[model samples]
Target: VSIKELIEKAKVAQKKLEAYSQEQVDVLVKALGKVVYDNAEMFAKEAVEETEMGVYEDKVAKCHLKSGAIWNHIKDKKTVGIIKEEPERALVYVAKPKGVVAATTPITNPVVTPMCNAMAAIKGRNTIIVAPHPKAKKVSAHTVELMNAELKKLGAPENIIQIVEAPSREAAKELMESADVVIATGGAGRVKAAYSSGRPAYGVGPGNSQVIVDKGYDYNKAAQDIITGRKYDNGIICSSEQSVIAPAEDYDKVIAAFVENGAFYVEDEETVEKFRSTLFKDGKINSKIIGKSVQIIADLAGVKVPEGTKVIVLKGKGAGEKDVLCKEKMCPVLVALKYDTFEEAVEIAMANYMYEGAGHTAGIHSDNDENIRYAGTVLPISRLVVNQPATTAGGSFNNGFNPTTTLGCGSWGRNSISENLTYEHLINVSRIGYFNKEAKVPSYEEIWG
Candidate 1:
């Protein structure tokens, strides 16, 4: 459909949703959750089969997490509420429902995006129209269908959440220009485009995070967590860690930790550089290669390597010399660098963030109380994964943050937003005050005097 048609349809849907009682909206959301739970495995299977990538089991995990854990987290968010009130002043302000939201998804997260974003919009008493990633359009379209079917079965409006089955760049553009608010989640170019459209847009930034292993870190545990984060979904998670920083003496220890966690760290520098150049030749990544097995990366890199190659590790010099570690593989790869001291490690870690585009994420493997306290405030990025997996930090119930379908880049840091851009960003608030005045107010200057 044309943008105009979609906009008109979306407006109608928004009005319908706005008319819903909070109880009615809650039922519809529960039904949507049921659809995910009932057919979770099937949807995950389809996504993996069609994409020829991603682990079906993991996608299913994500689906379950969104439908169950995330839903519960937002269950009491209370979208309809009063902002603030002053009883003495006899004033109160009411929150108004925002209109239709134009949402976009990325290929990396076809199923989770729509399910998560749509749930959030519904929570805010707004309607959502999703633009699926072109690469995974068919599967994403099916996800949208599943949600609508479930919502309809429960007697809710089907159009409250829609999927543009065959979305083009043109459709994305139209949605950005016409929708009440746009939440575009994809690559750098898409984020830039959404921002330029002049609509209130929240787009995710690129990821190249540094995980520092400073003094007092449990090398063994840190290593295991890093492996879990980097290899999860084959590291397609934008919030997945891209590099590591540790003391020079502990580099060998960290490598052992990685090997202990099932990752085969290849040490061939020339081959590593070759693969890095080929994948990010123009400073842009190749998604086809991303999330693939190391055997596949080895093949694409034109080499016959051992089957055990799960991650490729590289060494970077001290601060101002980490070009080798700056690139984002978005796969089961880790770049390990050496630092002289804790202070030097922090310096190099921050520099790595600059290379990664400031707003993404950073990680630290430390037990040092001082380092933990200092790092939290010193880091430039919005989210810092401490003693946890970086990849899951952006959207996890365990983290006490709302799950997001879109991640905002904090721009100068390589993204435009510093945190997860979820439902709250999709809606704007309009307030009307009710006042029972006791007396007329004097002019500002006279009252102050």
Candidate 2:
């Protein structure tokens, strides 16, 4: 179907939804998350087989994890009518819904991106039309079908959430140009298209997460955390830990800790070079090894790694532009480095991040608050995760980060926002002002100061 026709239907559904009360809107949003949570296996199974990337168990876990986190965050919030009142300021804020949302989802996360984006759009009484990646089009459409089915049971308006039957570049571009707001979740090509569509947009960045293992922290725990985060879904997660920068004094101990946790560390320069050449070609990623298993990647490089190896680790020859391995690794591979001082540690992370994953996220494992705060200030990243692995950088129940499927990389990454995209970003809010009885005029002397 043409995106133009689908958008017309979306606007009509949004018009009907615009009249719904806060309670009614909440019900519709709830249904979208519930259906995905209930049939996680069905969605995960199809996503893995169809996309042929990421682990099945990890995909299933993603459905459950993201659905619950997003719902809990937006469930009881006031998204309709007067959302807030500031008596002292004599102002009241009113929530207003955007007309329609155009969601261009990625193949890496075909199932949950649509679910969460749809829920956020519906929460604001706006309609969403999802244009999924062509490789994962069928499962993405199936996700929308399950969500719409649940909405039907709730007596919701028809076409409240729509999907492209078969996605194409033209169709995706058409939706972006027509919709009130656009959320593009993919590579630079797709994201740049959204920004050029002449519509308000939220763009996601490509990640090459850098992990800093500082002094005084437990190297054992840091190794385990880094491996756990990187090994998840074979390291396809954009926020997964990619490189580890350890103190020179304890670099060997840190390597030992990682080896204890099932990581196969490679110190041989020739062997490391083989994996590097196999993973990248002409300064870009080799499509074949992306999210592939350890054994498969090793076989492609003509090297042998022990079975049950959680991840394959290699010593980075240098930082930043020195080695291609410092760039993002979409597969279960990690680059290791060493720094002499705490400031050097931050510089190493900065150099590597600037090379590829700048303005996305960085993880610091440090017992000292000063070092954590220091690294947070120096790096050009949007989110500086403390103590924990960068795995939860997107959003988790334990962290203060807003639960979301789409993370904005800010202007540093050539995007609009620096934080996670929420329902608030999708809506426009108006403030009503009243006369303040206690208002006082400031003296000229005070005003000048």
Candidate 3:
């Protein structure tokens, strides 16, 4: 079907949903969450098979968390009617749903992105039309089908959650321009298109997340956390750490720990140069190796490593636009750097962010609260994960952060928001106010006194 026809259908269904009470909306959303959660394994398998990216088991965990946790966070919230009342101010806040949402899913994470974005859309009583990446259309369609079936059984508006079976650049552009709101979660080109679509858009930025490890941190634990985060989904997660900056005093310990955790260190200049040349061409990342296994990447780079290597570590010469390893690596390749002080660590992270992922995210592994606070203060990034695996913790309930697939990088990354995109960002609120009868005016002299 044409983009116009799909959006028109969504508009019709959304109009019906706009009339639903909070209870009715909650019930349908609850059903959607349950259905998606139950079929997590199927969605995960399909996503991996179709997209050829990410680990199947990791995808399954993400699917379950994205659906179930999002539901838990938004199920009881009011969306249809007066969500909040301020008796003191004689005002009430009524939630308003954007008519239709045009959302794009990334090939790297097809299932969770669509499911989480759809849940946020439903919580706000809005209909959504997903434009899945061509490579991941099958899994995206499967997820939408599961949600629509649950919506049907609940007697909710039909076609409230729809996916484009055959997606093209033209179709995606048309959908973004025509819809009431757009949520673009993918490549830089798509995000730019969404912003220029003449509609309000929520788009994410590129992520080349940096990690800071201070002397106070346990190198063993930090290594484990970093490896776990980077290896999850083969490092396709945008929030996954791209590099680590360790204190110079503890650099040896840090390297030892990383080696112990199955990371192959690229020490020789020739091998490092070869790896850089193989991974990037003319300063652009080679998409073919993105999210590939470490073993595959080793073979492609002609670097021999022990079997079962989890990641490849390179000592970066210079950070920012000039260095290849400083760029975002969708695969499990991490750049390791050393800093003499915590202040320098912050600078290193800032340089990394400025290079590619300006407003995405940065992480720190430190026992000193002052260092953590200083890092958060100095970095230009939006989300800062402290003492946690950035990949798993950035958008999960486990870290007490909002569970979401879309991590908005602020204006620095040319995005509309800087927070984790959730149901709150999906709706508009209209305020109703009453005239106050007991208000008195104050004289200038009294106010000054």
Candidate 4:
């Protein structure tokens, strides 16, 4: 079917969803999540097989974690009719469903992205038609089929969750242009497409996160966390630490810590240059090495590293486009830079973000509230993860933030929102104002002075 016909079917299904009660929607979401969670291994395997990227174990964990977290987070939340009330203020808020969601997912996190987006869209009582990346269309199609099976069990609308069997650039563009809402979860180009589709859309931005490792912090623990984050799924996660900025005084200690944690430190100038030249081609990130293991990257660069190397760390001097270390490698390569002052550290992180991934995320491993607040204030990014593995913390599932696959970068990154995209973003909310005689209006002088 044509994109128009598919969207028409989605719109019809979404209308049926509008009449669903909160309990019904909850049940539907639970069923869908269960299917994804139960078949996490299959999804992960197929994703890696189709895309030839990412770690199978990490992908499996992502599938289960994202699917389960989404269900747990939204189960108690009300999405239908009256969602909130403020009787004292004489106000009531009602939730309304947007029609159909047109989502373009990436190949990086194929399995979990579709599952998460579909659940979020369903929680808002909106039908979704996914446009998978051509590279992972087969896996994405199977994921949607699994979700649809659960929806069928719940007696949900037939097309509440659908996908194009064969995805193409043209089909994806047409899908975005035809839908009532769009969610673009990929690179800057795809995000730009969503924004230019003339429809209400949520588009995510690139992530070239800079990790700040402050002096006096637990060097060993920080190194372990950084390794975990950077090596997870071979650093395909956009929020993963791309580089580390350390205090000049603690540079040797930081390097030792990383070496202790299985990082292959490359300090030789010639070797670093060779590695840099191999990471990118034609001024774009090399797709061949993306999500490959540390040894694979080292091999590609014709460099020899010790066995059990979890990451490759390069000492960087500059934070500009010409410096390959400043760019997002999208692999198991992390850059280390030294700063003499806290202000300089913040500046280095900001410089990387300005180059790319502005409004995405940054990390600060410091116990001092002043430094954390300082970075948070000066940085152009949205999520500033403090002393946590950014890969798992940015789109947080447990602590506080919503469990999500799509992270908005705001206007700084040319995105519509700066927060983690969630079910609430998928729905439209309206407020009913009642006459309140007790409400007081402030005088001009009282308000101004």
Best by TM-score: 2
lDDT tens digits, residue span 230-267, model 4: 99898899889999898889899999999999999988
lDDT of 2 by residue, 37-107 (tens): 99999999999889888899998989999998999999998899899999888999999999899998998
State candidate 4's TM-score: 0.97
Winner of 2 and 3 under TM-score: 2
Off by over 4 Å in 2: none
Note the residue pairs that clash in candidate 3: none
For each candidate in turn, the TM-score is: 0.90, 0.98, 0.97, 0.97
Candidate 2's TM-score reads: 0.98
Each candidate's number of clashing pairs is: 13, 0, 0, 0
List where candidate 4 sits over 4 angstroms from the true fold. 440-449
What's the candidate order when arranged by decreasing TM-score? 2, 4, 3, 1
- lDDT score of residue 178 within candidate 2: 94
Please write out the lDDT profile of model 3 over residues 95-206, one tens digit for every residue: 9998899999999888778778888898899999999888998888888888888788788988889888877788888899999999999999999999999999999989
Which is the better candidate, 2 or 3, if ranked by lDDT?
A: 2
The deviation in Å at residue 197 for candidate 1 is 1.4
Where does candidate 2 clash, by residue pair?
Answer: none
Each model's lDDT: 0.74, 0.91, 0.87, 0.87
Ranking by lDDT: 2, 4, 3, 1
